[PDB]
Design a binder for these strands. Structure first.
Lengths: 50, 77
RNA sequence: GCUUGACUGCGAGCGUGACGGCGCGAGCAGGUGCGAAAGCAGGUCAUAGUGAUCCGGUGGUUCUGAAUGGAAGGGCCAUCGCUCAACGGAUAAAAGGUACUCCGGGGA
RNA sequence: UGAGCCUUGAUGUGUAGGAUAGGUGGGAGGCUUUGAAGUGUGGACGCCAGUCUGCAUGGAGCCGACCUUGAAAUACCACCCUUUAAUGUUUGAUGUUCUAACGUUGACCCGUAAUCCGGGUUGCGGACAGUGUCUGGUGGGUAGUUUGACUGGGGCGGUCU
RNA sequence: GUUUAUUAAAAACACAGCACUGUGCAAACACGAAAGUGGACGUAUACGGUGUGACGCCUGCCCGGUGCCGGAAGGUUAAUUGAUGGGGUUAGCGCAAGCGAAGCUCUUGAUCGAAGCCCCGGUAAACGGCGGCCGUAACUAUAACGGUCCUAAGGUAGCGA
RNA sequence: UUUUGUAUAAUGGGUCAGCGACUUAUAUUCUGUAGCAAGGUUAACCGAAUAGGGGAGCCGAAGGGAAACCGAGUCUUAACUGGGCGUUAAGUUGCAGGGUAUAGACCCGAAACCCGGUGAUCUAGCCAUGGGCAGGUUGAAGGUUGGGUAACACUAACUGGAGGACCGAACCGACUAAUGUUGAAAAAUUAGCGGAUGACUUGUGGCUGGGGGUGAAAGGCCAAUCAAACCGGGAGAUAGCU
RNA sequence: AGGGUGACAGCCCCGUACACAAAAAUGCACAUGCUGUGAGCUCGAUGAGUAGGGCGGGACACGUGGUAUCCUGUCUGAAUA
RNA sequence: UAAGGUGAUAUGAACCGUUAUAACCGGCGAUUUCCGAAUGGGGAAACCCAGUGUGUUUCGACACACUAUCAUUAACUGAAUCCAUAGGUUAAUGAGGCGAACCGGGGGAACUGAAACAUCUAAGUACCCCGAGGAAAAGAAAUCAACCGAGAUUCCCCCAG
């Protein structure tokens, strides 16, 4: 899915961009425990100025 | 029970239909799995018996939105 | 020797079956073959060589076409697939045991 | 490692022939002194015919209907094909490793003087196992049934049109 | 000892022993939609199933058939993937006969595709099988023996008139 | 009553009295009858409620044809001398009756299937807690001593009390025979018989429930029943049978 | 109307037709008051794991048939007057 | 309302009352032991066994009152793990059970019909379970109609076998 990375993620690393990823690696690693955020058009607009 | 907590899918009945169309009673069992969820508002492992489709509903709505819906219609977790 | 009448749409009237069916049929309408012609030919000397219906396959026919124009499907016509042999065919699909026997009727 | 895909370069001996001609198009000038023909080597293709090219020698040209050929240009520009090579994207196969899903009828902590269960820590596995839907094989374990009629009684034999 | 309460107390059933197979523990198996229990608070000198039935001498031959256990190239083969081809519909082109773009829809199903089966090898204290035809020894009978029968192989030991 | 056929020794009835079997609804056809007539007639409902109002709709005078369509004609065929079917005969609505269809459909009767419940106070197996087994014999392992052996082995005494051990009561069974067979008893009595310190027996309480339980395996047991218990419901199951 | 009174009752008796009566509780109507719910106008907004699709079923008279529509256990998945 | 009256089998005995406190009928109340949702714990239903607070001109022993579970809300507290949560206590409100049909939803056969029987029919009927009301359910169009329209749902008669 189109989650946006935040921290120093390894290869497929974006440092903040919309990239494609499987759902099993999105949840429970990139969603909670962090280093990413969902893209439901409320989070990405509030984190646009970050 | 095998009722899904998010969607509400209950096991319904069906029929075996072979080549000779002989009817035999059976049931439709959902694909339920006990999956553990970390929430951000309460900061707690929230375990839920969800379906394979009910996990996908959490992926769109969010884990905080589903727990607000479980509070409204009366179920507990 | 020469040809395709083993032809198409019909048929007064009659035989034969409970019925479904089956069998004979001059003559007429259209178009052919043989014979010079009168005429004959709607398979074979006759009587056996067979299978209803349902569901479909194929070809033809504007007949129907769920708002309209089409189409799918169906009907008509042509035609194919059943040793349904228990052959007027109960299903697309079916073998044994009962001195453990149990009911209903008649019998030594 | 099998495959697509995106650019970049090789790559093409029916036959005459200046010579290992990819097909159609635009097309008589493009390029070279920001150093070219034409020789001499290495790497390298191969039906060892010949060609590509780094470097170096060389220091000012190759090219065009050129006459030939069924079809004329590494003069150049475009869509690229056949074959083949490298990097790179992408989809699967095989195999190794790891943790975050998940399993724990391992230890330990708390609710809790509690062999259940739940929360928490830790250890060993680990995307297997297991489960749901779909599907092939197996399956009297079980369930519903079929298993014909005439007939010197019935069965055997035999018959049914 | 046990059993057909209420026709059959036995030759039956059970029995210790023996043998085979399953099972590494969250065991196999069984009851249960599941949880869980039993198996077991046991651990291959143990447990579950089958078979024979103290003990003594012993338990031969045949793996084709039917099961089981493997092995594995080829052949066929479900779900899934939907390549090509055909048909319907029509913007438009065609005085019309007809053809036909994209889009959508229908039909056909090239390819991917595991077990099972075909195939190969073991397993008889697994299920089973252990034959016909002739010739031949005394009084007869029998066949040590001598051929054929390609069904996988033809009754050994012990006995029985 | 059943039959080709009965006094038949075919079936049924002890008698009397009471009760007991061709109905009802909705459809359609025929006949009788009544009203109206090329028309007849309403259903629901309104209602001053058997009136009146309501003509939605059904049936009939027109059929042929698969249908489009054509029409007193039409279809089949290229077209019919024709042929097939029709045209030149009054139906419709009430009532009563004879039939059929669907409902239990003239009545009585199965053996059985399924669902929902009830029972292990009888019996089969088990779990926990207790009790019972008179009496009399046979004399194992072991212990001690002696003989014997190079020494063991081995043997002779006493001690010892092992046994799905023997005989035999209680108890637990039920093999033979007799009485009994509308019995005293819906399996018993008398006299013989088997086990009787164990794979025993027994009191009390609990557990296992029907397509299941349990079974030292008979298809036995599971409330005097068991090739699928009991009771209620589907149920007035069905019967081409008496 | 009906029943009873020693046999069959309009006039014997209880009633019937008719005409009235509620301290207290309560049903239903309008009338009024209070606590709350909330008019109307204009400007928006238009219900996403949803419609639809594959497989497997069920329900509409309609049994997969050329089979629409509706429901969904599984797998996916839009458009925005 | 009243001169009669103390339910009946059922008399008898003993009284009450006659002009408003006999009896009878109606409305509003009081009393309401024990069991049964039974709710202080248990239980072989009509019984057994307690705890807390409060009361004794006899402060021994009794009497009055309260104490089930669950849902929701509020307050006070409160682990592993520091904050937090789980968990614990108290208080207010409400639910539990019974009952004949109708209704909605979740499960759901077989006898039988097809002259047998498997698709089918019987039939979403019987039964079982949950929930609600005096009705429930349904209900203001992503519905029918066909170029004319109608304008939610439910029920009756036709359409129509």
């Amino acid at each position: 899915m189109q989650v946006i990375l935040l921290d120093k993620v390894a290869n497929l690393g974006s440092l903040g961009d919309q990239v494609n990823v499987k759902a099993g690696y999105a949840r429970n690693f990139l969603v909670p425990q962090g280093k990413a955020v969902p893209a439901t058009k409320k989070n990405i607009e509030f984190f646009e100025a970050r | 029970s095998r009722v899904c907590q998010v969607t509400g899918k209950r096991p319904v009945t069906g029929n075996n239909r072979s080549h000779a169309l002989n009817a035999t009673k059976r049931r439709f069992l959902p694909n339920l799995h006990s999956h553990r969820f970390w929430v951000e508002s309460e900061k707690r492992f929230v375990t839920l018996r969800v379906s394979a489709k009910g996990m996908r509903v959490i992926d769109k709505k969010g884990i905080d939105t589903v727990l607000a819906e479980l509070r409204a219609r009366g179920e507990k977790y």
